[PDB]
Amino acid sequence: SMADEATRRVVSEIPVLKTNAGPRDRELWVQRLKEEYQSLIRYVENNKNADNDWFRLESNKEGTRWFGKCWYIHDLLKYEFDIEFDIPITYPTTAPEIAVPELDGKIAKMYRGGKICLTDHFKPLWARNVPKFGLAHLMALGLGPWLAVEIPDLIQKGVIHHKEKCN
Numbered sequence: 001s002m003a004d005e006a007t008r009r010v011v012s013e014i015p016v017l018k019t020n021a022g023p024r025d026r027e028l029w030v031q032r033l034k035e036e037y038q039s040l041i042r043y044v045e046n047n048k049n050a051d052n053d054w055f056r057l058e059s060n061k062e063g064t065r066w067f068g069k070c071w072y073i074h075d076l077l078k079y080e081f082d083i084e085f086d087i088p089i090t091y092p093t094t095a096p097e098i099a100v101p102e103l104d105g106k107i108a109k110m111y112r113g114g115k116i117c118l119t120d121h122f123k124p125l126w127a128r129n130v131p132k133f134g135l136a137h138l139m140a141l142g143l144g145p146w147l148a149v150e151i152p153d154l155i156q157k158g159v160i161h162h163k164e165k166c167n
Contacts, residue, residue, distance in 0.1 A: 013042070017035040017039060017092065018131070019031045019032040020093075022087065032092070032134075033059075039135070040134075042136070043136035053071075054070055054071050055070040056068040057139075065084070065087075066086075069083060070083050071163075072147050072151045073166060074152060074155055077155075077162035078164050078166055079160060079162050079163060080163040081100045081102060085098045092131040093131070095126045095133075095138060098142065100114045102114065103150075106154060106160070109149070109150060110150075116142070122141065125141065
């Protein structure tokens with residue numbers, strides 16, 4: 001299927017996660033966080049080697065609240081947006097809800113608080129793969145493709161400003 005090959009191409013060099021543990025699961029959550037951070041840092045290294053280093057993430061010490069930035073390049077202009085999410089108690093079955101709060105009110109494919117609305121195919125894809133997908137997969141399969149639709153539309157409408165010009 002086209003959907004399966006599209007997912008395969010996006011995820012193939014992202015480390016797979018193993019531990020089926022959420023934020024209240026103590027030593028098992030510590031283990032899941034080691035997996036999450038190793039998957040994220042490999043995805044960032046892969047992105048840098050593809051001239052597509054497009055986000056940073058950090059967490060609180062408990063790994064239950066995540067925050068950082070994403071970047072989007074369009075017509076030689078770079079846009080930067082703050083991102084955040086909490087880890088659901090039923091993670092990794094339940095995918096976190098990434099928010100881009102500065103864009104709240106500007107995007108139809110968004111809920112209150114700037115929580116992005118992914119197409120209806122995302123949740124079933126996540127559900128099919130539990131507990132193998134983690135935060136790197138959420139970024140690569142979820143936020144990344146959403147930015148590639150919604151940011152060009154805001155630029156076309158003329159209602160966001162770039163952070164810097166490209167080189």
